[PDB]
Design a protein around this ligand. Sequence first.
Ligand SMILES: *CC(=O)Nc1ccc2c(c1)OCCOCCOc1ccccc1OCCOCCO2
Ligand SMILES: *CC(=O)Nc1ccc2c(c1)OCCOCCOc1ccccc1OCCOCCO2
Ligand SMILES: *CC(=O)Nc1ccc2c(c1)OCCOCCOc1ccccc1OCCOCCO2
Lengths: 340, 340, 340
Amino acid sequence: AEIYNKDGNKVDLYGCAVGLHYFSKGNGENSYGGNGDMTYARLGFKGETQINSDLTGYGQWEYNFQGNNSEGADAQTGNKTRLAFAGLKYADVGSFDYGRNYGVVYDALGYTDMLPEFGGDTAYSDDFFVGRVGGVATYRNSNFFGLVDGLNFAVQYLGKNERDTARRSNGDGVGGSISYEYEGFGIVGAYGAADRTNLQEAQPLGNGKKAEQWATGLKYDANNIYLAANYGETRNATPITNKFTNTSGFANKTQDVLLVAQYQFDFGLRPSIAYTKSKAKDVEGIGDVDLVNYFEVGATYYFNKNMSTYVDYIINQIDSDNKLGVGSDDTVAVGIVYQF
Amino acid sequence: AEIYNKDGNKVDLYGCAVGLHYFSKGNGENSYGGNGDMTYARLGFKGETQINSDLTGYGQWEYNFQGNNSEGADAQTGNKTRLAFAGLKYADVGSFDYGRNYGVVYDALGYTDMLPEFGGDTAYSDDFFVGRVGGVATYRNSNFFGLVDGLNFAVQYLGKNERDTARRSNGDGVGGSISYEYEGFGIVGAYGAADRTNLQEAQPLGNGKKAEQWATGLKYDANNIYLAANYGETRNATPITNKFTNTSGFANKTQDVLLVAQYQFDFGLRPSIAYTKSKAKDVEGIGDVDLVNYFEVGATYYFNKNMSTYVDYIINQIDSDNKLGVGSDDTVAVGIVYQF
Amino acid sequence: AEIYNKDGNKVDLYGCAVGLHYFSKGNGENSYGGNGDMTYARLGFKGETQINSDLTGYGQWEYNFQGNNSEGADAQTGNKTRLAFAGLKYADVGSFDYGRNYGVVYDALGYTDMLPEFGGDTAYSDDFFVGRVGGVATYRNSNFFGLVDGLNFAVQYLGKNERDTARRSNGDGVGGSISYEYEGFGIVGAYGAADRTNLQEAQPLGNGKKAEQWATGLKYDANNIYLAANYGETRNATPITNKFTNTSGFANKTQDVLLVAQYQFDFGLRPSIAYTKSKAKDVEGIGDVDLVNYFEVGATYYFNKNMSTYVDYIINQIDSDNKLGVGSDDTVAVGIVYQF
Ligand SMILES: *CC(=O)Nc1ccc2c(c1)OCCOCCOc1ccccc1OCCOCCO2
Ligand SMILES: *CC(=O)Nc1ccc2c(c1)OCCOCCOc1ccccc1OCCOCCO2
Ligand SMILES: *CC(=O)Nc1ccc2c(c1)OCCOCCOc1ccccc1OCCOCCO2
């Protein structure tokens, strides 16, 4: 909600309360999404200032607060700054922002990140370009310098984050993307390569001096319809865990496919049919292994901009015989949302 | 403070800064409330939306920020989401909300949780129903479907939270409550039973396949007077610690009594006289043990809705000879509050 | 930004997004400021209420959110409440506030804490009086009871914080300060003494039953000019680490000197020339050791109250041969700020 606007500075303070539960049999140690309470809160600010006519300065910070911890010691778990950045919109020339942000690859995969609860499984955190990373300078251009309508690109720069964990680390990298949006239709291309950290390289799973993530996208956003498809391929790039031998690291190569079909009904209900499969070719010890394999049945009922309840249900195509030992049970997710 | 209201959505953003100190002799390792700096901050949102005339959607998130940590490593301690939920108010039919929230039992014990600083000692966090728990679906009804004025109930559903700690865990449970409020007078009844987690059952202290919490309440809220009484009984339900043998778990049974007397003076000062005693019958190794035993002398001076300073002083009726080894010294608490 | 004002209560909700990077060679394990992503967010409230004409109640809470963590486990690092307090402004008689706050000494050292990114190196957290501490009651007086224009003092009371760490701990103490501000010119005096905690005393580095911090200040705030000088001396007061023998504690004595020269250009750019040197006399094992020794070249470009980018560059006068083993390389800092 816009809670400030004077002298050309406008500040939006927004949040939500998403009382949420997940439903699976057993512990759900072996289901897709887990089992039990999953409630969370968000709060953040989109700020924006006009420096002149030709110039606009902005900044954003969003934070995940978890509602499923006891007020004791586990009190802090899964709390995080999801976004924190700042930039300058120059008239027609462009827009530059540094901070923690979505990587250029997400300019593509984002398409199929539209399910009520789940979906967007290839969009990992601190996975170079496919999700939200820290230390990303991005230059984005709208309408090719204002000359070609709906033709947009972005060129991104990733800054070596050497962390205590290989999963969360990353080296120096570069990336880009181009999307063209002719009349409800949008097709996206996106690519990023990165140096790997020496800790990532001294992993058991994964082999290369370089991680790579590229994805193509297609969508139809019109007439209350959402159709979207995604094809991606990660090289030494997606993170994985042998749950049997308790081993960690990266998949040498992945081919990933995500498809979403959604229609928005007038009265509110937004039914959702989707599919997601990621598979890792040539993993060490195991060969070819599925990570994510499921069909999606779900419906968000919107009451207005602020209120909604959703049912999201992942029919898991993973068989119990999983070689990386992923979950094979189904996960039903039910939620009630107040956003502002 | 209400910081947004347009198009039928109203958002309240509220917080406080409570510079607070506690006063006890020695380390106060043996006093009632501790000793030293106790300053904290709160921030949260009560949001509310009108879906139509007959329908209202809401959500809340409140967060405890601690002010007594050094900016180093201890920086995060005692930080927590206290509330995070969402629900639907249907006209006269009712109101349903899931999330982290106060348990139905608190519909009773709440009465005597009115002291400036202390009091409400039987209202534990993640203690099933007596305080704030995670994963509670609640259906509350006002005025018995709008037919009997001031006659209210609630039926609650608790969702198995299997956690790393027995103190913080809990299984599947159900609860309810009825309160009737005839002219300043209010009498409450409240009951909840729950399955226990296998970790809770493999505790040294406590024995049963089930925890139980019921409490009765009475109050007089009128003429600047607050009188309230509470009688409760927890079965395998209240948590406790043998500080001698460093043992943990639950009291087999507790009888708990809380009484508050308060008058509000015109100019501002709200003097407060109160008493609280919890005792655990049939604890393992120890027999009958007092947990909380004290008298309360205190006064909140209110300047307005936003400003206040309070003195709260707990004369501790625990004798030094305590068999669970509780604190026996008095604790003086002084505070200065800016809320909004 | 002021987001609430009705019925005499005014509430400011303010924050920022500071996408920030630091530039150093090697790991920068040996540079002045580190190397890599350094983005952070802040959010807090300055609230204020009028109790009558003669009386004003206030409260503040500010919080540091870090933007450079992966969304995993390192997710929480360097998060902290920086301020959390409350107080009463009585007409001409004065103003009293308890909570977590800047210590009276900071009433002096504050002067040279004006660099774009760095500077103010002697202003440590939970270092008694020189920075932000927890459990400080402060009485501040403006214009000597409204009788001598621009003549101000403060008398402060520090409350024993016995913590898990000596670095972060502190005992019972008292402090004060007087500053007089004749026409752009301001000269400050400030002093504080404190009992030391037994854990601090059982440190290898440092010797005394008492820590002391006093600092003098001078400034010229006029005509778009900022000149300021600081002289300080800490006794058993500044914290330090032998990185060779991995030893911790306090410098027996420090003399500290900070100087800032800044001019504000009309169009926006604020160039900044500065210097900072702290040295510890009579440290155990080592003798005399420099802690901070550098020159400061930098420029904040302001677009308006909300937008800015800065370059800050510390030419490090520490030679590689450091006896406490401090960093000796230079650190370039680049940042982009949205505040509100
Ligand atoms: C206030 C608020 O946050 N409301 C809200 C409700 C339901 C939502 C979202 C917001 O979307 C953001 C979800 O945050 C998860 C990060 O986004 C993401 C990244 C990678 C893969 C999948 C992701 O989204 C999950 C589902 O988002 C769709 C709607 O969920
Ligand atoms: C902004 C703000 O929080 N102001 C404030 C000042 C003084 C208060 C309260 C709020 O009440 C909420 C206190 O939070 C503790 C949770 O409530 C609770 C649970 C169980 C037992 C006792 C409890 O309250 C402690 C005292 O509350 C009375 C007024 O305190
Ligand atoms: C919204 C926001 O916080 N904006 C902002 C941008 C740049 C800044 C500051 C704020 O100043 C506050 C910096 O916080 C650090 C605490 O202050 C401090 C203490 C001790 C020594 C040095 C300090 O300041 C560092 C630089 O501050 C100057 C401007 O930085």
